[PDB]
Amino acid sequence: SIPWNLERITPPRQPPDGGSLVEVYLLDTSIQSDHREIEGRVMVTDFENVPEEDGTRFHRQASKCDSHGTHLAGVVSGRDAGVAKGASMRSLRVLNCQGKGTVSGTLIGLEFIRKSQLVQPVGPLVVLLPLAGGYSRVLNAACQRLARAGVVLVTAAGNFRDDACLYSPASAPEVITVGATNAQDQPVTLGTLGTNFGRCVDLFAPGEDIIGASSDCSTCFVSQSGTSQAAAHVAGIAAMMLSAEPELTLAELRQRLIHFSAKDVINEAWFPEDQRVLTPNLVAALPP
């Protein structure tokens, strides 16, 4: 009677307003802000910086354009199926209708978050980056600077069944990088690819068949899979941890995430041989 992923992050031995001191910024596609699951919980900023869609005859249907971001906003704070039901979210559009963005657009978005914070500070901030490109010196630098300024960043490890160190922002050490595991606590396969792995991943979290808001209708739900969904679980857990202990530094928060994670439940045989000792065998969970 509960989505498998919400049961999985609950200690083995549902918080109704968790994470209320924290604001989660989401850099993703457009969102269906009037979907009942997230209405009133997500504030759509005026920020938009996206490349044009590929194909001269592309049809911009809101239900399709909003799919990715709406589901992730639901995973973080959704009324029925969210992790941190009291967290406020602010959304920035950096991915187009096909889920594609640019490093420059993402940089301008990260700058917009810091500028917004300086103008009207609130509580601790968590920035969710459910996206990946190739290793980028500039994107890693901007992420490092925003983390050093006191902001918590969480990103997807990437869905390329590859070493996360070859992608950004996954490869930025100051960012919490999250891989995906399934209901059997095994790394997620996505077609011929799957979750990334290696020394740049901090931990794993549920990322297969995750029930969340569907932009097909105002009350619809759909299951989705990917390291974006796993990163959204960690952004929700981080919002809950920071709301309970608002004075936590980034290093202390990372220590809490590791301490409360389920340990040694992943069969390391799924990863390439040399990556087994480098990949953390941790699946995120809430504290008791």
């Binding site: 509960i2 498998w4 029925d80 029930i211 739900f221 759909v222 299951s223």
Partner: peptide, 10 residues
């Protein structure tokens, strides 16, 4: 969980 529903499945 896998699927699609017109309301919250649980």
């Amino acid at each position: 969980c896998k699927x699609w529903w017109p309301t919250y499945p649980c």
